[PDB]
Design a protein around this ligand. Structure first.
Ligand SMILES: COc1cc2cc(c1)NC(=O)/C(C)=C/CC[C@H](OC(N)=O)[C@@H](OC(N)=O)/C(C)=C/[C@H](C)[C@@H](OC)[C@@H](OC)COC2
Ligand SMILES: [Mg+2]
Length: 215
């Protein structure tokens, strides 16, 4: 019954990453659907990493043998969740790779946009994760790596993100991206739309992908 206590750490995004997020959020782009391609591609890379690590150390699969991606639309919460059982990320990985450290592709990509380039090019510049903000007002990343505890990263943009130990349902290993969709982007909760986008953009994943549909 006693009051629970939880630690949170708040971080500022690196300057160019903050500028990138603002550009993605406040500019109109057609072809926003490519966000799902980018997230699935990141999952595939995380899956490749645990796969190859396990060839040399099979104990790394003690946290889960199955290597796959699950897509979970939730119309009640208005969330689309992409879950993989890839290598996952440590706390240090989250902090370094999801916000605080500069990427070499950020500037070149922003300038490419502000010249008319299609947003689809984002993955080539190594900042494809941020395409989530084309469709989501808030993104929560839950992750579990063999070498660390389970962590939750979250940002509604505006310049900062938080990291905390996750009190939610334990995952054996991997990463779960929860997209809290903007009110005008609920088409990405529809089964037909999700299937269309995966069929169009994500046909060479290398791992099984399953769509879970309520009701
Ligand atoms: C193309 O491949 C990459 C690689 C990187 C960045 C991006 C794409 N591109 C990005 O835009 C960023 C900021 C990705 C952040 C990291 C991704 O997180 C979300 N959910 O998309 C995460 O994905 C999942 N499912 O685990 C990935 C890919 C983690 C991999 C395994 C891990 O390698 C050891 C990361 O360092 C810890 C790599 O970071 C660099
Ligand atoms: Mg790949």
């Amino acid at each position: 019954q006693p009051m629970e206590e939880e630690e949170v750490e708040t971080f500022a995004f690196q300057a160019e990453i903050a500028q990138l997020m603002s550009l993605i959020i406040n500019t109109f782009y057609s072809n926003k659907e490519i966000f799902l391609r980018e997230l699935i591609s990141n999952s595939s890379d995380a899956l490749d990493k645990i796969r190859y690590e396990s060839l040399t150390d099979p104990s790394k699969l003690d946290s889960g043998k199955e290597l796959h991606i699950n897509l979970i639309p939730n119309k009640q919460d208005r969330t689309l969740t992409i879950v993989d059982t890839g290598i996952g990320m440590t706390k240090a990985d989250l902090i370094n790779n999801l916000g605080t450290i500069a990427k070499s592709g950020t500037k070149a990509f922003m300038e490419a946009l502000q010249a008319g380039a299609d947003i689809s090019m984002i993955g080539q510049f190594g900042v494809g994760f941020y395409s989530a903000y084309l469709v989501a007002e808030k993104v929560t990343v839950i992750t579990k790596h063999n070498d660390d505890e389970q962590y939750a990263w979250e940002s509604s943009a505006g310049g900062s993100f938080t990291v905390r130990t996750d009190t939610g349902e334990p995952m054996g290993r991997g990463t779960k991206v929860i997209l809290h969709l903007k009110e005008d982007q609920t088409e990405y909760l529809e089964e037909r739309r999700i299937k269309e986008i995966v069929k169009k953009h994500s046909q060479f994943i290398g791992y099984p992908i399953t769509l879970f549909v309520e009701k």
